[PDB]
Amino acid sequence: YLLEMVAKDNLFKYTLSNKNILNENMKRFILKNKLAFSLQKHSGQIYHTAMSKKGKSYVKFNMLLQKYILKNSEKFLSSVIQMIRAHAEILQIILQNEDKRTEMLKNYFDNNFNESCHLGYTGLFEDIQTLLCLRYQENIQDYQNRNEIIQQNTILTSDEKEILIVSPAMDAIHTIFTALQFIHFINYNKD
RNA sequence: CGCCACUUCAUGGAAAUAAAUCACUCACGAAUAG
């Protein structure tokens, strides 16, 4: 499922082809070169995201995973993870503010985590900010016109529109959140 | 040299101002499925 209907964007094509919309205008919005992964921990919690392997977001993601995963010595903060989840709407507003997006992201990550212990994790914060901004830019480039035209479609049911319309900012936030949770899941031992 | 007192008895200003507003850790673990 992850390879077919998520990584290869076969949800979009299949859903449109079932209702016989398809057509060349929508086919040019089909996206490929994507990585999709899910992590089902022993409990039933799924961490599932998809990202483009074209562009700088993938290389920043790989460098972050190389950086903050301990070997067998940059330090990792675990409370940023719950900040991403809880403050997702605020991060969406900050990302959608185009003119001052980087400045607002830095100010938000500085005003939160504004304590003495957080001075040692400035590298993590700025890495997260840059990766999130890159992910949002690639997301908007890949999805904005697609979402706009899907919204205007006159035969699609609201359920299909909702499962097809991908929010550019929340998907980037979720990608960063899942990357951070994968880092924490690798790092933390039950000791 | 002798005689002798009456007065006046709080006003004006400052009446809180800045720093920190939660932080870190745990965000499921096993068993039952394969």
C-alpha torsion angle, residues A12, A5, A27, A97 (rounded to 10): 60
Contact A136, A104 (CB under 8 A): no
Phi, psi of A144 (to 5 degrees): -65, -55
Resolution value (Å, 1 decimal): 2.8
User: With the CA atoms of A156, A36, A26 and A165 taken in that order, what torsion angle do they form, in degrees rounded to the nearest 10?
Assistant: 40
Beta bridge partners of A50: A36
Residues within 7 Å (Cβ) of strand B: A 41-43, 45, 77-80, 82, 112-115, 117-118, 184, 188, 190
Amino acid at A16: L
A85 CA → B30 C1’, Å: 27
Beta bridge partners of A46: A40
> Which 3 state secondary structure label does DSSP give A61?
helix
Provide the token pair at A18: 């079932």
Q: Given CA atoms A126, A107, A91, A119 in this order, what sign does their dihedral have? A: positive
Query: Which of chain B's bases lie under 7 Å from a protein CB?
Result: 20-31, 33
CA angle, corner A170, sides to A141 and A6, nearest 5?
70
User: Among all strands, which nt has the closest C1' to A121 (CA)?
Assistant: B24
Which nucleotide is closest to A184, CA to C1'?
Answer: B27
State the maximum Cα–Cα separation within chain A, in Å, rounded to a whole number: 59
CA–CA separation, A53 vs A120, rounded Å? 30
CA A172 to each of CA A6, A67, A138: distance values in angstroms, whole numbers, following the listed order: 15, 20, 9
Helix (H) or strand (E) holding A35: strand A34-40
**A191: how many CB neighbours lie within 10 A of its CB?**
3
